[PDB]
Amino acid sequence: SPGIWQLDCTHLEGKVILVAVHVASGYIEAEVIPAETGQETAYFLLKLAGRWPVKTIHTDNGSNFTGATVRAACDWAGIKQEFQGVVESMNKELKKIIGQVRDQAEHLKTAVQMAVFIHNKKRKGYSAGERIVDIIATDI
Amino acid sequence: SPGIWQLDCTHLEGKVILVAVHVASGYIEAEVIPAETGQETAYFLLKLAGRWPVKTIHTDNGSNFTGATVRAACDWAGIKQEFQGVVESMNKELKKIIGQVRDQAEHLKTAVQMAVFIHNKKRKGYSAGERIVDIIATDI
Amino acid sequence: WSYFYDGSYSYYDYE
Amino acid sequence: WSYFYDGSYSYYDYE
Numbered sequence A, B: 001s002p003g004i005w006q007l008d009c010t011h012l013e014g015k016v017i018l019v020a021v022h023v024a025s026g027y028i029e030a031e032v033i034p035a036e037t038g039q040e041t042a043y044f045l046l047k048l049a050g051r052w053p054v055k056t057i058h059t060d061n062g063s064n065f066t067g068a069t070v071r072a073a074c075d076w077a078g079i080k081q082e083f084q085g086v087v088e089s090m091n092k093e094l095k096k097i098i099g100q101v102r103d104q105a106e107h108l109k110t111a112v113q114m115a116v117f118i119h120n121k122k123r124k125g126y127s128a129g130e131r132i133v134d135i136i137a138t139d140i
Numbered sequence C, D: 001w002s003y004f005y006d007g008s009y010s011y012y013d014y015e
Helices: A038-051 A068-077 A086-104 A108-121 A128-138 B038-051 B068-077 B086-104 B108-121 B128-138
Strands: A004-012 A015-022 A027-033 A056-058 A080-082 B004-012 B015-022 B027-033 B056-058 B080-082
Touching: A004 A038, A004 A086, A015 A038, A015 A086, A027 A038, A027 A086, A027 A108, A027 A128, A038 A068, A038 B108, A068 A080, A086 A108, A108 A128, A108 B038, A128 B128, B004 B038, B004 B086, B015 B038, B015 B086, B027 B038, B027 B086, B027 B108, B027 B128, B038 B068, B068 B080, B086 B108, B108 B128
Parallel strands: A004 A056, A056 A080, B004 B056, B056 B080
Antiparallel strands: A004 A015, A015 A027, B004 B015, B015 B027
């Protein structure tokens, strides 16, 4: 579980948002991508894998997660792919936060990263951003 | 020191690369940005701050790190700015790794993230990617 | 703003 | 490839 991630692709304002959820912590990373292609998903995954121990990703079967460029990035980074309502829980939570801050950002992409911040930093002892590093740190 | 970062702006293949170095661990994040503007630096910083406890950034005095959009992002995220050869040590190390993998990537941007990966994952006990989360986890 | 189940959205905050 | 101190670069690996 220290290295299991859920990745999903959702749409806001007629744009594409890539969402990665570290299932065990609820930590989120997200980005607005130019297009729903394997190329952009491979880039995102490569960045994700250089930050965190990414061992397995669960995605749906869209052409952007099964394409050739995604398969190669996962081979190179050493990530096994597989093809829950955890995704939907997070997409809804993220959309709600984006809606609440959107007026403070010239562009969607900025609002997305504001919402990711707000999500990862909020406490209830241990935010999701604190939980992910504690999970990993413990795994060493 | 758990939250001190060095940010620099360097050039490869006639493009602009933003580099963030977590000084205490040597952990690196980097991205190829469309232009050397405050807007793109503010986006990068916002993403950085939603992942890690970013408390202080040290930059040079270029117009991309002092502009109005950067100042606002740091206010919003709660980051103090300040204006070593740690930057040069990392830019040289990163360029060397990028040079060695560039042929395996269609585009510079991919090679950059391959080099960041290689850098953060390499051991000597505790890679820089393991060191950063252990530093932070300990700080909780 | 409000983002709906379908891809559409509104500038108005209904919730 | 080789990336030099100035912004220039070469496709050749000199080191």
